[PDB]
Amino acid sequence: MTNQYGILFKQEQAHDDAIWSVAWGTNKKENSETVVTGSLDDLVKVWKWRDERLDLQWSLEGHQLGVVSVDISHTLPIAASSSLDAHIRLWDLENGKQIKSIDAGPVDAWTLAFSPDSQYLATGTHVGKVNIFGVESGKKEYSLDTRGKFILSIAYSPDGKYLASGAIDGIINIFDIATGKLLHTLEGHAMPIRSLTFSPDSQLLVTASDDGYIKIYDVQHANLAGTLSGHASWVLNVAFCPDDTHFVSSSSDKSVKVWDVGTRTCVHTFFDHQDQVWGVKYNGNGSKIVSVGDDQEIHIYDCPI
Amino acid sequence: MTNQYGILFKQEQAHDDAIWSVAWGTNKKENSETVVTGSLDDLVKVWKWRDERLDLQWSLEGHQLGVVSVDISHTLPIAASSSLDAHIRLWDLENGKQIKSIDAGPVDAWTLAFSPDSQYLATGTHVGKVNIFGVESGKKEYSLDTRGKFILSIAYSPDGKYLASGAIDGIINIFDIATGKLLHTLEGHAMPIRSLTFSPDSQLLVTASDDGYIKIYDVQHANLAGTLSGHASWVLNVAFCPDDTHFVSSSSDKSVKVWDVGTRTCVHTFFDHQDQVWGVKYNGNGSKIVSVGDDQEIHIYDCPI
Amino acid sequence: SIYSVFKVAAIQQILGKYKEAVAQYQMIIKKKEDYVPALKGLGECHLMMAKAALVDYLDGKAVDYIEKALEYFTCALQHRADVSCLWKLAGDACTCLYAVAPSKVNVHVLGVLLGQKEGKQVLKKNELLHLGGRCYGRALKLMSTSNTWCDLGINYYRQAQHLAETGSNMNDLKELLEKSLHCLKKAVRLDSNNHLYWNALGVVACYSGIGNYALAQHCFIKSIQSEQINAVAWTNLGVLYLTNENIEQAHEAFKMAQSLDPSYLMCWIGQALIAEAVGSYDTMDLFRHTTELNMHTEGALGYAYWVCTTLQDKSNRETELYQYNILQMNAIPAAQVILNKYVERIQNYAPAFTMLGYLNEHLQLKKEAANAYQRAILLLQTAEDQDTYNVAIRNYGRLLCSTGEYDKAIQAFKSTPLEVLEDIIGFALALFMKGLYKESSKAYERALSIVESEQDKAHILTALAITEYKQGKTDVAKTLLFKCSILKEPTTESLQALCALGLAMQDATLSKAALNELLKHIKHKDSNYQRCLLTSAIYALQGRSVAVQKQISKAVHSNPGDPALWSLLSRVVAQYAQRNAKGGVVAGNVAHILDSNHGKKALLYTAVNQLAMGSSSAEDEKNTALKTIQKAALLSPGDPAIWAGLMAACHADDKLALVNNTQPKRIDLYLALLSAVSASIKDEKFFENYNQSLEKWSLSQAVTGLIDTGRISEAETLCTKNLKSNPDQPAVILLLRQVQCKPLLESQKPLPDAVLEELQKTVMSNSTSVPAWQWLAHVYQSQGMMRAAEMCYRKSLQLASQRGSWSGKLSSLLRLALLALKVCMANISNDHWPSLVQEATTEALKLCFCPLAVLLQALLQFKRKMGARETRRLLERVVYQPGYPKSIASTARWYLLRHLYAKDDYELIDVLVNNAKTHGDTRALELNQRLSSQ
Amino acid sequence: MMETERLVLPPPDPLDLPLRAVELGCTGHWELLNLPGAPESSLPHGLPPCAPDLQQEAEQLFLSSPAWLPLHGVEHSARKWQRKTDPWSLLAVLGAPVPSDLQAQRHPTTGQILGYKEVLLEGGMDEPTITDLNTREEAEEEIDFEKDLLTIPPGFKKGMDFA
C-alpha cells in the first residue's frame, strides 16, 4: 500500500559547514524551481534543479556571521536572509546584488517570512512582539504585541488574514491581519516550539515542539485533533504538502518522516542524513522533497501523488 | 593445603592521588622487572624492582588530565598511556621522551592494549567501534565496527587471531584478527564489564562484571563453564596467571583474592588495601602479584609455585 | 444554457470534493439569484459537511454549518414553498443538531420561519426542535409517506430526550412519547418490510420512560428478518440482553454482529463492557482499540478510568503490564486528547474534569489542570461537599500556587476547613512562597503535631528548618536538623539540607560530617550529579581550588556515562584551574556527543575553554570558538553567557584578523549584543551578584571594543548615560577617562602634570585590578616615565601574585621586560635597565618556558656583545629549535643573519637563506638581497 | 620617584624594526607584530563570568524553598475515583433517505426545459399549529403489535422472557 519512494539525487558537499535553512520556490509561472540555502556562513548559494540534477548558479554573499534562516517569495523574484550579523538584506535573485539592507538586532528580528502577496516580511523579536517591516516602502511601520517570552516561529496562512507565532515555553498566539487583535492564545507544550506552518484553505494548524510530540490543532477554536508521537529526538522543521493529505517532518534523530493527516500514521521513513536535519520543504506540486542536514549534504527525494 | 603467602614489600606513598592502572613487563631476557603506573595525574612514573625493593627511575609526564590506562610491551622497550586529555602519547621507556603523540578523543579511544607483536594498539570508542592505529607506521588505518554502547575492555589472545571486547550493559563481542568478522555475541550480564583477559594457549575467557560475579567462558563456542561469586562489591580488574592453574581478581570491597580455575574456589584472600583497588597484574613467571589501590600505596606479594 | 453546468456541478458533488461543488454553486448563483436547484444543492452539501464535522468532535464548526444550511434553505423556501424536498430538508437541518452541548447551540434563523417576518432572531435547542417538528408536519401534509412519519417520530423522540436529560420535567412528556410511538407504528405499518422502521420502533419502545421490552425484542427480530445483514439490530439486541443480566447471550449476539461487520464500534464497546464485567486481562486493550476506532464517549471513559487506576496504583512499576501499557503505547497523550474531546462533548462531569486535571498535572500542563480544576469547582459547589469538593479545593489551590498567583492560592486555602494534613501543608507552602514565614512556621508545627508516616515527619522537620533558616536564627534550625538525624532512619533530603546549611556558613566541618553520613549508608539514590556537586562545593569552600578537578575526574572515571558529569567537568575546568583548556574543550565536545539536550551548556563551556586557550590549534576552520558559540546560540538563544561569549569571540577574531593582516570583519554589533544581554538578564528569577558581574563585564568589554574600533562618540555617549542613570562608581569613571584619553596622546603631545595627577587619583580610586595598573603604566610609558611605569608594573605584579592569579603575573613580567629592553635600546648610560631585563627574564624562565623571555635575553646580550661566538650560538639555537611561533623565529633569523653578515661567513649565510626559503618569509630575503648589493 | 621626563630619540633607525608584542589567550601564548602601537591584548578584562560558583548553586538547589520536597509531589496524595457505566448510550438509529429528486422536465420535440416538478423515487406559509390529530384514517395492513409478539431470536434456541 505504501508508495514507491526514491532519492534520485544526492549531493556530496554543497557547502563547507552545517546547513540551517532551505527554501524551494516555484515563483514564476513556468518551471523555475529555485532553491536557496544558507549554511552557518555568509554564503546564500542559490541552486537550480534543471532536469534531474542541481546546477549552481549564484554564490551571492555579503554577510559577516552565519545565516540562520532563508525564505523565498512566490510572486516576485526576490529573496531574504537574516543572520547573527543583525542585518536583513534582501537580494534581487536574478542578478543577486544586495537590493536593500535593514538594521535589526537579535532583539529585533529572528526569523523571516514573506507575506502571501510578498509585501510585509514580518519577523519576531526577543521581547515577544512580532516586528513587521515593509518591502520597498519603509522600516518598522507597526508591530503586533503579545505578552510572552522569546519568540521563534512566524507563519502565514496561504490565504491571509491569519498570523501564527510560536515561542519559547510553548505558548502559542494567534493574530488576525484584518484587525490585529489577539483572538486566542494556545498553551501548547512546555518546551520551545521553533516550528510552525499552515495549510492551504487553512483549517488545520500543525505544531512541532522540543519534546518530540506533534500536536494537530484546529484554527478559529482551541480544539486539538490529535497528538502524533513517532520520533525519538527533537523535532526541528515541519513542511506541509500542496494537497491536504500529507506533511513531512524532520527530527534530530537523523530521520525524516512523512505523516498523513487522514489516518494519523507514518507511511514511510527515510534512513539517510547521518547527522541532524535542519530543514525540509516541498516543491510546487507534491512530487519531490528536499532536505538539508547538519552534515554537508543536500538530499532530494521523490514522493508520488 | 593453602601455600604460604607474604608481602615482603610495602610502599608508603608512590604518588599523590588514586592509582588507576598498572602494568608489569618482563620485556628483556634478563631481569628487568619494569613496573609502570599511572595515577590520577600527569605522572606516568616508571619504577624498577632490582633485587628486593622498587627504585624509581623515570618520572616522565606531559599529560593534562588523569591517566586512565597504561600498558607495557614484552618484545621492545616501549610504553603507552591515555587520559581524559584525548591524547595517546607513547613513551620510549628507556629515555622516556615523547616518541609520538596521536590525537584521539574519548569518542575515539578509551583504553590501551598492545599487540602480541606490538604492532596495532587497538582502542575502543563510544559508538562501539574498535579503532586500531599503527605504531611507527600511521594513524587509523582501519577499525572493526559493532553496533553497541560504550566499550570498556579490550583483550588479545596470546597467539593472535582473536579480539574480545567488554562493554557497558554487559554485551560481549568477539572478533577474529585474521578476517575481522563478528563470530558470536554473548549476552553476559546487564551491567558494564570493565575487565577482560585471555589465557595462554588461549581456550578460556574470564570475565569480571559490576555485580560481583565472575563468569568463565570458553572461546570458539558459547558454553560457560561456571559462575564464581565470592566478592561483596564491584569487581574492577582480573589478571590471569602464566600457567593455566590460577587467576587473580580485585574487587571494590578492599580485598584481593586469588582463585583457581580447576576447582573454581578461592584458595587465599589478602586483607590489605584499606580503600578500593583499581589494578592487579602478574609478572613473567607466576611468583609475585602487584596491586594498586585508590589509596597511594604500591603492594607486591609473593605466590609460590 | 445553465442546466448543463448545474448537472456538472451535481455530478461533481456526488464524487466527493464538496468544497469545489460549493464554490461552483456559488458561481452559478452569481449570475442568477433565484435558481432553486443550486440552493437545494448547497443546503444538502452544508448538511453533509456538518454531519461529517459532527463525526469528529467539532461543535463550533457544526453549529456554523447548520446556520449556513438553514439560511440557504429559507432562501430557497422563499421562492418555492410547495416542494416536499425543501420542507423535509429544512426539518432534517433543524433536528440534526441533537445531543450537542446544550447552552452552546445558538442559531440565527431569519424571516418567515418565526411567524411574522422580522429581521433575525435567536432560537434555543427546544425552539429549534419545535421548528423542526413544524417543518416535518408541513412536509407530511404536502406528502404523506412512511419515511416522513418516521422522521417526525424521531424528532419527537429527540425533543423528549432533551426535555428528560436536563431534568426540566417528569411525567409531562407522556403526550410526546405517545405521539412518537403512534408515528413510528404508523410508519412501520405503511411498509412492514424495512429493517429501519422496525429498528426505530424497537428503539423508541425500549426507552426508559416506556420500557416495553417485549415489543422492542419483537421489532428487533422483525428488523433482522427483513434484511439478513443487520449489525445495528443485532447489537441493539445484545445491549438489551447485556443490561438484563444475560452475559452469555449478549456475548453471542455481539460476536455475531462483529462477524457480520468487523468495523462497527458499538459491538466492540459491548465486548469491552462484558470483559470488564467478568474481570478479564485484556479489558484495557479492548478499550484502547475502541477509542482508536471512532472516538466514542463510553470507550473514552472506560479507557480513562482504567489508565487512571493503573497510574494510581504504585506497586505495578515492574510487573511488565504497567511498563508496556503506559510506555510502549504512549498511553498518556492519547488519553489526554481523548479527555479533551470527551469534556468538550459532555462538560457536566466533575470526575472527568478531575481525571483530565490529573493527567495534565502529570504531563506538566499546569495551566490546563488549573482550568479543569476551576470547572470542577464551579460544578461541585452544589454537591455533598465532603470528599469531592474539599479535594477539588485543595488541588486547585496547589496548582494555582504552582503557577504564581500566590494571593489567590492563599485565599483558596483559606476557603476550606483546615483539619487535614494536605490542606494545612498546602496552605503552609503557599504562605512560605509569598513570604510571611511566621504563620507558615506555625502551620508546619501543627502539621508536625498531626503527622504520621514518619518519613513525612522527617520531611516536615526539614521544611521547618528551611523556613526557619529563611528567618535567620540558624542555631535552632541546626538543632532541628540534628533532631531529624537522631531519628531511627534519616532521609536523603534532610541530609542534603543539612550539608547545604553547613555550606552556607564557613564552618566546613559540620558539612564534612553530614557528607560522611550521606556517603556511609545511603546508596539507593540514583543521582550522581547532586553528590558530585556537593563534594566539589565542599572542596572549593576551603579555597584549595585544585582538589576539585581530582574529585570530578574520579567521579567521571567511576561513571563514564552520565553526560551531566562531563558537562560539570568542562564547566569546572572553565572556572577553576584554567590551564587544561584543551581538556575542557575535549570534555565539552564529548558531553555534546553523548546526548542532545546537554548541547547548549556543553558548547558554551567548550567555547569558553577555546577562548581561554587562544589559537593553540592547527589553524583549522569549522572548529573555532566563533563556530561553536554560533552553534550554542542557535541551540538556545536565551542565556546571557552565550552573547557575552559572542562578544569575546568577535574581539578575538578581530585581533586574529589584524595579526594575519587580511581584513577586519564583524565590526559594529556590540550595541545590539549588549541590548540582547540586558534583555535576557532581565528575565531570570534571581542571580543578583552573578547578574551584576555579567552586566559589568559585558558593558566594559563593549566599551573597550568600541574604543578599539574607533567609535569614540558612541562610547562617550554610552558612558555619560550610564553615569547619569545612577550615582558615580569608580569603574565607570575610569572607563570614561580611558574613552576621553583616546583623542589626546595617540600622536606625540605633552600633557600637564595636573591631568596625570587626577588620572593617578582615579586609578587609586578603584584598586585591586591589574588591567588598570597595566594601562596606567602604558600611559606613563607613552608620555615617557621609565621609573613610574616600572613601579606601576611592580605594583600590578605584586597584586596579581597576592590574589593567586597567574596570567597577570606573566603579563606584568613580559611588559616590564619589554619596557626595560626598549629603554636599553636607546643606548642610554646608567646601565641598570639591563639588570632589570635579566632579573625579569630569569623570573619568567623560573615561572615557565617562555620563548619571548629567552628572545629578550638574546636581544639584550646581542646589544651588549657581537664579537663572542656564544651570541651566535644562542641565536642559532633560538631560530633552529622547533616548537616556536613564526614571528619569534623570524626575528631570531633576522638577527642571526645580521650578526653573521657582520661576521662574514657566507656558508652560514647561505644556510640561513635556504632555511628561510623552506619556510615562508619575505623580509629576511629582502634585507639579505639589500645587503648583498652593498 | 623623580618625575623627570626622559626624551628618547625620535627615529628608531631604519636598520632595526620596532618591538610590538601581542598576547593571545589566558594560557600563555605570545607573538610579535611589526607595527608599533597598542599592546593589543585579547580579552583585556578577563574571561567572561560563565556560570555561578558552586556554593551559590547548592544554596539554590535546596535552600530556595521546600517545594522540591516529596511531600508536595505528584505522588503523596492517594487519590481515587468511582466508576459509573452507561450501557444505554450504545443504541443507534438511522434516518430514511429523501423520497424525491426534483427532476427537470422537457418539451417533447426540440428538447427544452419548461420547469421543475417533483417526482417520486424508488395558505399562510408560517407553519401554524401543524400538529397531526384525528389519527387512524387509512388501512395499510391492519397489523397487530399488542397481542402476539415474537420471543425467539433468529439463530437462537430460546429467548429471554419478560412478564
Author numbering:
A (entry chain C), B (entry chain D): 1 to 305
C (entry chain B): 631 to 1564
D (entry chain A): 1 to 122, 157 to 197
Would you copy out the relevant sentences from the publication that reported this structure?
The ribonuclease in these processes is the RNA exosome complex, which degrades transcripts in a 3′–5′ direction and in a processive manner. The helicase can extract mRNA from the ribosome and is expected to transfer it to the exoribonuclease core through a bridging factor, HBS1L3 (also known as SKI7), but the mechanisms of this molecular handover remain unclear. We show that rather than a sequential handover, a direct physical coupling mechanism takes place, which culminates in the formation of a cytoplasmic exosome–ribosome supercomplex. Exosome and ribosome thus work together as a single structural and functional unit in co-translational mRNA decay, coordinating their activities in a transient supercomplex.
Processing of the 40S-containing subset allowed us to obtain a reconstruction showing that the ribosomal subunit binds to the helicase–ribonuclease exosome assembly through the SKI2H module ( for the 80S-bound reconstruction) and to the SKI2N38 gatekeeping module. Fitting the structure of SKI2N38 in the density revealed that the C-terminal repeats of human SKI3 (TPRs 39–40) interact with the ‘head’ of the 40S subunit, in particular contacting the 18S rRNA (at helix 39 in expansion segment 9) and ribosomal protein eS19. Notably, this region of SKI3 is a hotspot for mutations associated with a congenital disease known as trichohepatoenteric syndrome (THES). When we superposed our reconstruction with that of a collided disome, we noticed that in a configuration in which the helicase and gatekeeping modules of SKI238 would bind to the stalled (leading) ribosome, the SKI8OUT subunit would inherently be positioned to interact with the trailing ribosome. In the active ‘open’ state of the helicase complex, the regulatory SKI2N38 gatekeeping module not only recruits the cytoplasmic exosome by binding to SKI7, but also engages the ribosome 40S subunit. The structural and biochemical analyses furthermore suggest that the SKI2N38 gatekeeping module can bind collided disomes.
